[PDB]
């Protein structure tokens, strides 16, 4: 509710030149009243008259109806930033010491220097890649300061800190002015030409951090990073974080030389400009009390919000007898028992998987009588099959003749790594084998990433120690020979076994299409990179193989991407490092009570997670939309809050206000309301109370809820014609002809949409759908009242059960200690009372008998299993090649719809003995209600249920008719 009113301040703040609220309602009489109020408001404003009398004349509308959005009639230029910023440009601009970056262009020079001419310029090295503007951030920041310019006591101190810092940003930006952003939210050459190239990204990071400060320490930290980052753009993040690995070993629940290693980390930080942050760690080392460890964590998390190290592709590419090691035997075990049908029909499975396949070059295509630039690997199969070009038995050579294009992955505080771009023959020849490999991993604890439904908590608990950072080793030219030799050595079935082998052989000698300016060079490449199916799976096999080789009783051994550990000091560490050295491999072999790795660090016997997800600077420009960009931003914010870092929620609200609004005219924007924004739908961006999900309980919410589903999926005048060409029909039929026998169409209908659901990706479709959606969306807010609802959802089901639950105050004592100290108090309180789980809740039906039987190579989603299970015994399909399971399919479907596995709920033990407070759906509804109350009150409530026997049958029918709501942004799933 505070969001809707806050938005008013923001609009009044930006505009000084009318605001015409818009109210809707399920009530029919009120609705006409809403229309009268609305109509009169325009007239009054377009006539320069008051509106105070009208509001009094519509108290019923304000008090009893729902706000749908707030129109804004403006007539300035949105250049209020230039004017507002000056008040804060009092400080002295920063001057970047262009003598800090080993790589010239990494230095914050003047754009006109790095790129003398326009045809030479490329924001490819600093692009925020986010669909929001720098001016907006500046505007948003100014709004908060105006609002909190009079706060008192401690609140004021936050302002003084925020005020100070922001000045650094305002002062520097002011010197060069505030850069103007184009429709594509990019930053052209003319605007950039006379300004410090790395200005825009820097401002975003500085703004993101300064709007994340609260305590004094946050300020010094935001302040030191903000300043050094302006000139240092290649080691600040690495330097600030680096010592965290040694620190974990320090606290109870170390050899002299280890201490020196830490001193050097501190010195390097010091010799690099740092002052206060190094001092803080120094103070911490006097007692090394886990009680004061939270600070060390804020530093490691904060170092990430400095931005993304985006260097030139070639530079990134450039960094790249005793090999017992090439154990990599592991391959055989994973594929020993399996004439598995999967291995025999590997070609169909890989073909089907394409939806979850990597990416290839944006080839040229023709379907029917047109041309397109699709980059999706699946479509390539369509063009090739309908062109006699499709030839999987012949996997394209990846060498000098036909080199490998290149993709990339950027991450704060680490040298850029490259990603191959192999054709589709490679994915197809790798899906079945990898998939079979994973099943073995799935039940092998050594692979801490795959094992069962295991969550990071299980991994944490396992650690009766020695940890490593084999990230560089996975790309060490030395590694490729062994790695490939082992996979090949281990290697319908023979056809598949052989083809996979060839992928390795073509790779053994792989050339890279590495760009080098507006030109595409072409150098060699004797290192291994990612881009193959087997990448993540095979990489682990190698990493596990490596530690076994290196390893004066092995209690546990584990792998996890770029880290491998084992619980079995100065002598052992030396012996370990020298051993790693002998194999000529760059690695961080440490030894300790604690361990640190890329995904989680265990300092003090407590589990910690890094919290540095850049919010105002994205890694790459995907295909998401401005709206989805916001829902994604809010997702990111929640994950951070949960992990540690916390950007002020008011700021986030401001961004959502900027990011969601849409203009119908050149002087009229339409800011969607809080009800429109948070109501559970395909456009839901956030929650009206972090960590708590609501569901239509009032008539209005449901009235609007059914109304929104309507314009949820709007056809694409491209995604249909594509299925109209012989290509699509041949591809679908061709795939099916080797998958079906009887009348499969239930299966057949799904496959088509399986493609029609990703096809939008193609710009002309995503853009066509996105632009068209605006016309429908704008009109949608206008006038509805005409919908033939009949479909039911969780909202409708839950609304039914509510009245039958009797709530009464109950009490729950805190008994479980803390192990994830960063969790916000309200979240931490639930774990303290009911505990937490170290497992994921089956939300796909994968663990049902019918599914196991179907596992034919086909794989029906939870939705399909749900629809199929709801069928008559006669109809129940097993057309594929092959029970009262009916309960389990529904359970997985329901849990999926409640995101019980994502968000903060994934950290709650929903089967906690303590969560007695309740007296399948009635129960889960009972549990969610109690948990949510706990989060929003700190106290517990006990629920009683006297659901009549008659009501249960009506409800039972509803259960098998629930539809979904797509929005993927909501994605909070972090561990």
């Amino acid at each position: 509710g505070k969001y809707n009113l806050i938005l008013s301040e923001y609009l009044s703040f930006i505009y000084n030149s009318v605001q015409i609220p818009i109210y809707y309602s399920s009530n029919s009489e009120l609705e006409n009243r809403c229309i009268e109020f609305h109509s009169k408001c325009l007239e009054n404003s377009k006539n320069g008259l008051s509106l105070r009398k009208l509001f009094v004349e519509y108290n019923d509308v304000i008090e009893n109806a729902t706000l749908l959005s707030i129109l804004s009639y403006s007539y300035d230029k949105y250049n209020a930033v230039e004017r507002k910023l000056v008040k804060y440009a009092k400080g002295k601009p920063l001057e970047a010491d262009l003598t800090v970056n080993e790589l010239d262009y990494e230095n914050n020079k003047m754009t006109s220097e790095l790129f003398p001419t326009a045809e030479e310029y490329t924001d490819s090295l600093m692009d925020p890649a986010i669909l929001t503007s720098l001016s907006s951030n500046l505007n948003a920041v100014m709004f908060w300061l105006e609002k909190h310019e009079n706060d008192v006591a401690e609140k004021l101190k936050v302002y003084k800190r925020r005020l100070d810092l922001f000045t650094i940003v305002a002062s520097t930006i002011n010197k060069y002015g505030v850069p103007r952003h184009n429709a594509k939210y990019r930053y052209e050459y003319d605007v950039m030409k006379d300004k410090p190239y790395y200005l825009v990204t820097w401002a975003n990071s500085s703004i993101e951090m300064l709007m994340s400060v609260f305590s004094h320490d946050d300020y010094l930290i935001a302040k030191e990073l903000i300043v050094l980052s302006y000139s240092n753009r290649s080691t600040l993040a690495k330097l600030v974080s680096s010592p965290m690995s040694i620190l974990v070993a320090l606290v109870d629940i170390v050899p002299d030389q280890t201490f020196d290693e830490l001193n050097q980390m501190l010195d390097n930080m010091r010799k690099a400009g740092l002052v206060d942050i190094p001092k803080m760690i120094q103070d911490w080392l006097v007692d090394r009390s886990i009680e004061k460890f939270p600070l060390m964590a804020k530093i490691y998390s904060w170092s990430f919000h400095v931005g993304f190290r985006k260097q030139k592709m070639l530079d990134a590419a450039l960094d790249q007898e005793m090999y017992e090691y090439t154990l990599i035997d592991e391959v055989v075990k994973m594929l020993e028992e399996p004439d598995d049908h999967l291995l025999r029909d590997s070609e169909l499975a890989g073909l089907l998987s394409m939806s979850s396949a990597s990416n290839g070059e944006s080839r040229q295509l023709k379907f029917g009588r047109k041309t397109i630039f699709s980059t999706k690997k699946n479509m390539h199969v369509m063009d090739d099959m309908a062109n006699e070009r499709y030839t999987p038995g012949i996997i394209p050579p990846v060498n000098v003749d036909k080199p490998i294009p290149l993709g990339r992955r950027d991450v704060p505080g680490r040298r850029t790594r490259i990603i191959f771009i192999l054709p589709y023959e490679y994915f197809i020849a790798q899906h079945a084998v990898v998939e079979k490999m994973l099943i073995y991993a799935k039940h092998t604890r050594e692979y801490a990433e795959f094992y069962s439904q295991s969550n990071q908590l299980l991994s944490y608990g396992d650690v009766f120690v020695l940890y490593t950072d084999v990230s560089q080793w996975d790309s060490s030219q030395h590694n490729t020979q062994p790695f490939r030799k082992g996979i090949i050595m281990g290697l319908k079935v023979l056809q598949t076994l052989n083809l996979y082998k060839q992928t390795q052989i073509n790779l053994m000698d792989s050339y890279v299409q590495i760009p080098d300016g507006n030109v595409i060079k072409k150098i060699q490449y004797g290192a291994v990179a990612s881009g193959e199916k087997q990448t993540k799976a095979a990489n682990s096999i190698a990493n596990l193989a490596l530690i076994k080789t290196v390893l004066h009783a092995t209690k546990i051994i584990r792998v996890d991407g770029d880290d491998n550990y084992a619980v079995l000091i100065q002598d052992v560490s030396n012996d370990v490092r020298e051993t790693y050295a002998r194999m000529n491999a760059k690695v961080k072999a440490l030894v300790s009570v604690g361990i640190e790795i890329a995904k989680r660090y265990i300092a003090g016997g407590k589990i910690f997670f890094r919290a540095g997800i850049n919010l105002l600077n994205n890694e790459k420009r995907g295909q998401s939309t401005q709206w989805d960009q916001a829902a994604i931003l809010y997702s990111n914010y929640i994950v951070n809050r949960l992990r540690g870092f916390e950007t002020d929620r008011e700021f986030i609200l401001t961004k959502i206000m900027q990011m969601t609004s849409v203009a119908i005219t050149g002087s009229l924007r339409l800011f969607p309301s809080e009800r429109v924004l948070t109501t559970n739908s395909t456009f839901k961006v956030f929650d009206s109370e972090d960590f708590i999900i609501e569901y239509g309980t009032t008539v209005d919410e449901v009235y609007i809820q059914r109304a929104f589903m309507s314009l949820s999926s709007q056809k694409s005048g491209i995604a249909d014609e594509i299925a109209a060409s012989s290509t699509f029909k041949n591809y679908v039929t061709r795939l099916s002809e080797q998958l079906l026998f009887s009348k499969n169409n239930i299966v057949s209908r799904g496959i088509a949409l399986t493609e029609k659901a990703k096809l939008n990706s193609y710009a002309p479709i995503s853009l066509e759908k996105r632009r068209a959606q605006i016309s429908a969306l704008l009109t949608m807010l206008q006038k509805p009242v005409t919908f033939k609802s009949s479909k039911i959802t969780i909202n409708d089901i839950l609304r039914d059960i509510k009245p039958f639950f009797t709530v009464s105050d109950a009490h729950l004592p805190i008994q479980y200690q803390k192990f994830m100290p960063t969790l916000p108090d309200n979240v931490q309180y639930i774990i303290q009372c009911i505990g937490s789980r170290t497992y994921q809740i089956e939300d796909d039906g994968s663990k049902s008998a019918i599914s196991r039987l179907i596992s034919s190579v086909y794989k029906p989603s939870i939705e399909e299993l749900y629809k199929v299970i709801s069928l008559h015994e006669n109809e129940i399909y097993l057309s594929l090649g092959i029970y009262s399971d009916k309960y389990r399919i529904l359970e997985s479907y329901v849990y999926n719809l409640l995101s019980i596995n994502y968000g903060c709920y994934q950290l709650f033990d929903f089967n906690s003995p303590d969560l007695k407070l309740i007296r399948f759906i009635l129960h889960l509804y009972a549990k969610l209600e109690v948990i949510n109350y706990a989060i929003k009150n700190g106290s517990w409530i006990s629920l009683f249920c006297n659901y009549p026997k008659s009501e249960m049958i009506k409800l039972w029918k509803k259960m098998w008719n629930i539809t979904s709501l797509r929005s993927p942004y909501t994605n909070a799933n972090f561990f």
Binding site: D252, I253, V254, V463, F464, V465, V567, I569, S592, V593, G605
Partner: peptide
Amino acid sequence: QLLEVLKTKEEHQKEIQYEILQKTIPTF
């Protein structure tokens, strides 16, 4: 967890002493 925060607090005790002896051994 305990069986490894005590193979480090017992390789100090063990050390210092295994050495208090080495000072009784004129071995370069």
